[PDB]
């Protein structure tokens, strides 16, 4: 008998290989296993750990934010382990070099017609294996519509969480608990 919690065995969990059995993703996984093992670059470590992500932990990043992130850093290669969607709200995109999993077929055309070069992670591993002069990025995680529902309950003070409502309107959860004149103001 020894005084330990669950015999000391780690009770947290993390991904160690993507649930996705996409063969191309498994091949990237093997490549970056090699790189993080023989190279000891923290950048490769982060890239690996982020290929071991779900699609709700890999939200899309659009150019209207990518260009923000590339404004004055055209020498460094942009890396987004996720998706690049276009954004019809921007007009002039600097010729930028971005590496990503996927490019929406209109965003890839936008980048090519702007004159940048549009990479995949193997092409990234060619000319930045340790990640020389690279700019790692993540898309907005808590921007997902589902997240607007999370946190402390809708009906407690100071909470600004969207309650699950089957439709908007006057009759759908406006009456008692949302105003002084019927009951109380949440």
């Amino acid at each position: 008998g020894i005084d330990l919690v669950a015999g000391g065995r780690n009770k947290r969990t993390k991904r160690t290989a993507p649930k996705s059995d996409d063969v191309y993703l498994k091949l990237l996984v093997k490549l970056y296993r090699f790189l993080v093992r023989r190279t000891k670059s923290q950048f490769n470590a982060v890239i690996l750990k982020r290929l071991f992500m779900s699609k709700t932990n890999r939200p899309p990043l659009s150019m209207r934010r990518l260009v923000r992130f590339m404004e004055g850093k055209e020498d460094k290669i942009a890396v987004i382990v996720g998706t690049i969607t276009d954004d019809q709200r921007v007009y002039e995109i600097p010729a930028m070099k971005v590496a990503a999993l996927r490019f929406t077929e209109t965003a890839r055309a936008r980048i090519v017609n702007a004159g940048g070069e549009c990479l995949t992670f193997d092409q990234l591993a060619l000319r930045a294996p340790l990640g020389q002069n690279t700019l790692l990025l993540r898309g907005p995680k808590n921007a997902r519509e589902a997240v607007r529902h999370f946190g402390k309950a809708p009906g407690v003070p100071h909470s600004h969480t969207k309650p699950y409502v089957r439709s908007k309107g006057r009759k759908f959860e406006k009456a008692r608990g949302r105003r002084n004149s019927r009951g109380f103001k949440v």
């Binding site: 023989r38 190279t39 000891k40 294996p129 340790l130």
Partner: protein, 51 residues
């Protein structure tokens, strides 16, 4: 061009050697052990050999 040198060397756990009564190992842990023992014995030598 960037990988560190490959490491094929497998280091297993080393068998235990008696750290108190194995001469070879006690002289790798405490190299002065033999000198202290010799001093003590060579001090006993006179203390007995006198009488």
């Amino acid at each position: 061009s960037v990988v560190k040198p490959i490491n094929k060397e497998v280091k297993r756990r080393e068998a235990r050697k008696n750290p108190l009564k194995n001469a070879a190992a006690v002289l790798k842990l405490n190299p002065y052990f033999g000198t202290a023992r010799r001093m003590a014995v060579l001090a006993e030598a006179a203390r007995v050999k006198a009488r």
